[PDB]
Amino acid sequence: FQGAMSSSIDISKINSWNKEFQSDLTHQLATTVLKNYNADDALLNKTRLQKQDNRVFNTVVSTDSTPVTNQKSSGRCWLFAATNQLRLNVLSELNLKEFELSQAYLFFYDKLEKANYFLDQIVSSADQDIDSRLVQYLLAAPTEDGGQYSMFLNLVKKYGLIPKDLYGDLPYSTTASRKWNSLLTTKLREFAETLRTALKERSADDSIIVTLREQMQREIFRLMSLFMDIPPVQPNEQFTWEYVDKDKKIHTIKSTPLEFASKYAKLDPSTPVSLINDPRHPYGKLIKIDRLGNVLGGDAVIYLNVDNETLSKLVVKRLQNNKAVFFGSHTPKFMDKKTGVMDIELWNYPAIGYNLPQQKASRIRYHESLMTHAMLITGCHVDETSKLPLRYRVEASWGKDSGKDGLYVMTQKYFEEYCFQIVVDINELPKELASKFTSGKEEPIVLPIWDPMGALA
Amino acid sequence: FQGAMSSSIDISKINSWNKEFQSDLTHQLATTVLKNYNADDALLNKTRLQKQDNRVFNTVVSTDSTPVTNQKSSGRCWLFAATNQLRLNVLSELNLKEFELSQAYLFFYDKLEKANYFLDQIVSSADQDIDSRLVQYLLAAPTEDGGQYSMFLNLVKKYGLIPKDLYGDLPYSTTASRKWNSLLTTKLREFAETLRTALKERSADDSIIVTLREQMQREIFRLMSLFMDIPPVQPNEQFTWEYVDKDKKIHTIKSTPLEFASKYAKLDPSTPVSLINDPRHPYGKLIKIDRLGNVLGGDAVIYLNVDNETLSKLVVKRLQNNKAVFFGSHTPKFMDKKTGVMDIELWNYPAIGYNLPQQKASRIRYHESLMTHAMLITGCHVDETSKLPLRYRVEASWGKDSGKDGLYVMTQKYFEEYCFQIVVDINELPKELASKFTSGKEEPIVLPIWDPMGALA
Amino acid sequence: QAYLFFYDKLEKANYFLDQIVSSADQDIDSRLVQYLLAAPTEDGGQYSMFLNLVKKYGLIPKDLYGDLPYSTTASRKWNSLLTTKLREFAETLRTALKERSADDSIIVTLREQMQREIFRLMSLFMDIPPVQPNEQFTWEYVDKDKKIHTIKSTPLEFASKYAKLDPSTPVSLINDPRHPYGKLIKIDRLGNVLGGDAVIYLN
C-alpha cells in the first residue's frame, strides 16, 4: 500500500511541481513555444546549421549518381542503395548521361521468395504454439519490403540484374506497396492456419503437405502476377537492350540477367561482407541473425562486429578505391529532410533541459534505436592535419526534392551513434579481419529473428 | 571625440555582451526559436488564449449583423462601421434576413469631395513653400480611403444613403483602390503645381483661377467616372427599391437618398458626437483636428476628451439602449486575426524579456500608437458583483473568414490602451458633458492636420 | 477530450515505470520487457481505462480546456520524445534494482524524480488542467434560446451531476470466438492508472 501510494501520481505533487516550473523563465518560454509548433521545427538550431551544412568533400567517387532514384511508398531503400552502388559501374563503363538497374526486378522476386520463405518458416515452427513468440512474429509482417545486403546477394545469385529500360516502376504497387502487401499477407495468414492444421495429423513430407505447399506457391504467384508482371526474361534467358551513350551513339547489348550482373554491373557476389558496430557484443566477433532471409536456403545475415574507428577507416579506404559505401542506420533520427543534414546536435533540446545520456548499446537493447534504412555514402571529408573523417556525403533514394537534390551531409558523430552497418569487399579488410570470414573456427553470436540489427526497411 | 567614441558601436562590447547572453538558457532558447518563426507566431500564449477567448456576452444589441461585410483592399473601414451601425435599423424595421446600405455610394462621393478639398487646401496654402511641412503633407496622400465620423456625417447630409441593391461593390476599384488612388493622386500633384504657379501672378479670385479650378474638378470627375459610375440617382431624386422580407413577401419602397437616410436608416445627423481618450490633453476639453476633412465647408473633426471610466460607461449605456458603438483604435496592435482576439497580453513577450513601459500619452506623442481603423462594438460583458465591462464583442468589416466569423473579442484593458474614440448620441451624455457641445464657451484645443488622432484608414 | 488525454498520458508513463520495476527480474530481451518498451505512451485505450480516469479526475466542459496545443492534434513527436526518456529511465531503474530492492529509499526517490521529469516534459507540450478534480470551476454559456447561464462545479461533480456518469454501471461485452461464451476475459497488465480497474470483458 505505502509503496503503491508512493508510486501513484499525486495531484498535489504535480500542481506543486507545476508552480515551481512556471516560476522559471526558460520553462515559461518553452511551454509557450512548444504548444504552438512541432518540437523539431521549434528547436532546429540555425546557428549550428550554418556551420554543419557543408557540402565540400575532399575524397569522393569519380562517377555521378544520375538520375536521383525514388522508391516512393515502399521500403525498397536497400535495393536502391545496393544497386545505386553498382549502376555507377555501368554509367562509367558505357558513358551514359543516365542509367538505372531495375530495382523493380529485384523487388518482384524478393517479395515472391519471402512469401515462399514464410510458408517454410511456418512448417518448421508447427511444433510451437500459435501464440508463441516466434510464430506470432512470423505472422506479423511476412512480406515487408525491407531487406539486408545478404538478401540482396541471394537475389542476384539466382536472378541476376537487368537494365531498368526493360522493366521499370510502371505498376502502381511498386511505388505504393502497402495494399498489395496487405492483400498477400492476409492470404499467407490463411495458409499458415491451413498448413499448421494439416500438420497436426501428417508429417511435413506427407505428399499431402507437399501438394498443399505447392498450391500455395501457385496461389501466391497468381496474386502477385495481378499487381506486377513476372520479368520478361528468365535469369539465363537472353535479352536485347538498345541504348544511347553521352555522344548520341546507338548500341545494342545482348546478354542474360545473370551475365549482365557480372559482365557489366561488375558484381562478384563472393567479395562483399558486412561490418557492424553493435556495442552490445564484443568486437572481433561474427554476428548472425537467426532465420532472417528471403530466398529459402540462401545465405544468412552475418556481420563482423568492429569498432567505429575501424569502421570509419574502412569507409575512407573504400571511397579512396573509388567505390560508394552501402550502409544502414536509424532513419530518421536526427535527420533533417528539408536541409539534408544528419547531425545529432542540430536541434537545441538541451535549451529545454532535454538530454539523452543513454548510450548506443543500451539504446539498442532498450528498444530506442535499430537499423531502419539503407543509403549510400559517396564521399567524405578527411581532416588534413593527420586527422580522420569529419563528415560524409550521403545519397538517398527519395527523389531530387528530398534533402539537397537527394543528398545529405552526415557528421562523423552521427555515423558513430546512429549508423551500424557498412558493406565492403573482403579484399579491403586487413588479413586480421578477413580471416574471420575465410577461416572456419569463428563461431558466430546468434541473435533472435526479431533482433534490432536486421532488415533495412 | 570621447563622446562620439562612447556613443559608437564597439565591436568588443557587443561580442562580450553576446557571450554573456549566450550563457543564459532563456536567451539560448529564445534565439533558437526566434530565428525559425515570426515572433507573434512563436510567442502567442495559448494558456492565456484559453481563458480570454470568451464569446459569452450578457449585454448585447438585439439585431444581428447579417451578412458580414468586407471592404477588401481599401481603407473603407469607417464607412462600413458607420453604416454597419445604421443598417441594423433597416433589417430590424423591415424584417430582412440580410441587408446592406451601399458603402460604395459614400465611397464614390467621399473620394470625389476629398480630391476637391485637396485643391482648396493647395490654394489656401499657396503662400507657403513647396517644401513646407503643410504642403508636403497635403501632397502625401490626397485621396486616401480613410476618414472620420464627422466626415461620414458630412457625406450623409449632402448625399443621403441608399440600399446596396442599387449600387454595390461591382467595380474593381471599390475592392482594390490602390491603383485608382495612385492615378488620381498623380494628377492632383500635377494640378497642385499648375495652381501654385498660376497663383504667383494672380489672386485666388481672378477668373483665371476660378476657371482653372473648375477644369480640374471636371478632369477629376472624368477620371473618377472611368473607375466607378456616378450613383444612379441624385440626393433629392427618387429611386425605386424592390425587396423581400423574411416571410418571402415582396415590397416596393419609393424614396430619395436623403429621405431614406432619415425615414428608414433612422439617422439624425444632429445627435452623434465623438468622445476620445487622449491622455496627452486634459479631460473635459474639446479637441479639434485642423484642416482635416472631405467636403469643402463641412463640419470639422471635433472630440470631447474624457477618461476611460467615463468612456467605458458610455459604451455600456449605449449597448443597453440597444445600439452598437462606432469606435476607432490602433489596428492591428495586439490583435490576433486567426482567433479574433484583442488582448495586449496574449503574447508572452516578457518571457523573452521584452516589456513596454511607455504609457498611452507618450505612445501617441512618440509615434508608436495612433488611430488606424474603425470597427463596431455590438456587445459587452459586465461583471455582476457591482463591476464594470470585462470584455467587448467587436464586428469587423473583413469578411466572415476574419476572426471568428468576422467577430473579435476585446478586453477592457485593450479598450483602455489601444482604442481612442467612440461615437454616441449627445442625448446619451450627462448634462455635464453634453453642455460642452451645446454651450458656446468651449474653446477647443486645436491640433495639426497630421495629428495621430485622425482618420480611421 | 484533451483533459482526459493529458492525464491518460501522464498516468501511463507512470504506469510504465511501475511495470518496469515489477518485471526487473526478467531479462531485457524477454517478451514482456521488450513489449513494455515498445510503446509506453500510445494514445489508445480501453473503456475501463476511461472510467479509471473519470473516477480520479472527473470531466469538464471543453470551453475550459480544448485542443489548442499542437501536440493534442499531432501527438506523434511528443510521444516519441517522452518514450525516449522512459526508455532511458527503464535502464536507470533496472540497473539500480540489481543492487537494491524496490523499497530501498533510493528506488523510491529515483522513481519520484522520474515522475517529476515526466511531468515537467509533459507540461512543455500541454498545460496541466486549470482546476484540480475537487476544485471548483466557473462555466459561462448560452442555450439554444440565447439565454446566459453560469454553472459552478468541480470536475468530479460535473461528471455525475451533468454528464450523468455513474462509473458503477458500464460493463463491456465482447464477441471473441476463441473462447467459450459466458466466460469473463481479462487482459493482464493492460492499464493506465496504477492500481485502477483491469480490462475485463464478458464474452
From Swiss-Prot, chain C:
Keywords: Cytoplasm, DNA-binding, Hydrolase, Mitochondrion, Protease, Thiol protease, Transit peptide. Coiled coil: none annotated. Homohexamer. Binds to nucleic acids. Binds single-stranded DNA and RNA with higher affinity than double-stranded DNA. The normal physiological role of the enzyme is unknown, but it is not essential for the viability of yeast cells. Has aminopeptidase activity, shortening substrate peptides sequentially by 1 amino acid. Has bleomycin hydrolase activity, which can protect the cell from the toxic effects of bleomycin. Has homocysteine-thiolactonase activity, protecting the cell against homocysteine toxicity. Acts as a repressor in the GAL4 regulatory system, but this does not require either the peptidase or nucleic acid-binding activities. It comes from Saccharomyces cerevisiae (strain ATCC 204508 / S288c). Belongs to the peptidase C1 family. GO terms for molecular function: aminopeptidase activity; cysteine-type aminopeptidase activity; cysteine-type endopeptidase activity; cysteine-type peptidase activity; double-stranded DNA binding; mRNA binding; RNA polymerase II cis-regulatory region sequence-specific DNA binding; single-stranded DNA binding. This is Cysteine proteinase 1, mitochondrial. The N-terminus of isoform Cytoplasmic is blocked. The keyword Mitochondrion applies. It comes from the Eukaryota. The gene is LAP3. Present with 521 molecules/cell in log phase SD medium. GO terms for cellular component: cytoplasm; mitochondrion. The keyword DNA-binding applies. One of its GO terms (biological process) is response to antibiotic.
